[PDB]
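Submission sheet (multi-component)
Chains listed below:
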Amino acid sequence: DCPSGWSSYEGHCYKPFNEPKNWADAERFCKLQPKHSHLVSFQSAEEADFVVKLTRPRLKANLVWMGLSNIWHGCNWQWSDGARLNYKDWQEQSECLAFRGVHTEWLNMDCSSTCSFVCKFKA
Amino acid sequence: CPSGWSSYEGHCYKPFNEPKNWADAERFCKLQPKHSHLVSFQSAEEADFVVKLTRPRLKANLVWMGLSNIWHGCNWQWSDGARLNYKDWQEQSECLAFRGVHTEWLNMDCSSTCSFVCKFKA
Amino acid sequence: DCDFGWSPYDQHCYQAFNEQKTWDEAEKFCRAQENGAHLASIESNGEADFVSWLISQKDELADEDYVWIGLRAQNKEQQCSSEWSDGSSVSYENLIDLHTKKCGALEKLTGFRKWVNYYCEQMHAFVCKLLP
Amino acid sequence: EDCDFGWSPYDQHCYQAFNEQKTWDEAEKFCRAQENGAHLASIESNGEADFVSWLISQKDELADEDYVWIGLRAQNKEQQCSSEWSDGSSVSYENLIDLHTKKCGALEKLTGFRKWVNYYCEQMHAFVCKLLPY
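Outcome: structure written.
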């Protein structure tokens, strides 16, 4: 079961927050909850639908963080000519994933953007 | 280069208008007095030379080059990571050809019949 | 058990979608279904037949000539012959006006059974497969 | 050896910046059709980064371009490269249907055509070819 202000779906508890935060601050806010939580993860379409039913009333059209960060690191970048990728000069930016409180489709956002969020833990 | 063959950068070339499939063309090149192969292109300048050579008698006919079965060796895999044990491919092979007036490559069934050019190192 | 809209065969669930999408978008669409499906892999004659039947029963697919399945070439090259018949390696190539065929499809002309390689960016119906 | 007409020498390679706007894949294909088989430029040192930035800056026709393709390409097949959620679970379900691939590298006008950025592969932009003549 779920504490007051949280909602239950298949053994987990979920709560949306409106306070805009960057990804790292949002994830930390969930981690500071009395039951240590995380930004929402989606394991199914039915789970995503439930979550947007939660966000729709108060988060509305706001962007909402989900628990995937730095999505362009780990892509196994290589040179088309087969040269060694030893020298590096990437811009220092990272992107994280978000959804709209209205829709389940994912969106890439700069990790320093401030968005609403939803926290999740297992009951 | 010997009589009937044309010279370019240390290699010898000869165009043939007799339509053959890819394998029969390649075989034919191998069976000439100087053992040759279907033409290979190592630069754009070489492709330009060959097209100059073909234009007069082969014209807009498709002309084979020495690349065969181009869709085999692509490391085909399943997007879900399943083992590719069972195979149910259509039996078809493609090979590459060029038009006798332009350097752009075209993928063709290897059993189509095209003109061709042979090549060997002098 | 399969969910609504899906058809069972030998422990997996399948659905043919009539929405025409590129191979990549079709795969992305399958990943957004249920607990994350993929384009169908075909691992036996019996599965090959069932997927053919599945396609044949989609009335919306009557005008459709190719249907995407999950076969994808992993080689980065635009054509997969790395040597010329003369033994030399391929470096120069003029593939400017040619589209590559690095994705696998089932085709109406051959009864949606035999696999054919085809152009990834062409837009076609597709079949997803999952474990329920 | 020797750079052909239109190509610029730096160290042992020849380079050319093209204002023809092409997708990443078309740009790589076009480079492979040049001379003895060029490729989109790899950048392997600070001096080469300086050189490529200068070369783009020398191209009058590239005045209003925002991105210029170079040969950086992601090899991971996934459409986003985080395979674990922050909660530790593996990614299976994904809902990327509205988005487009960002797995190609470019130089960008905003930062002087020096720092690498990733951008959308199917967008048409100017590009730079690098050749080892032979």
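Remark: The two ends of chain A are 6 Å apart (CA to CA).
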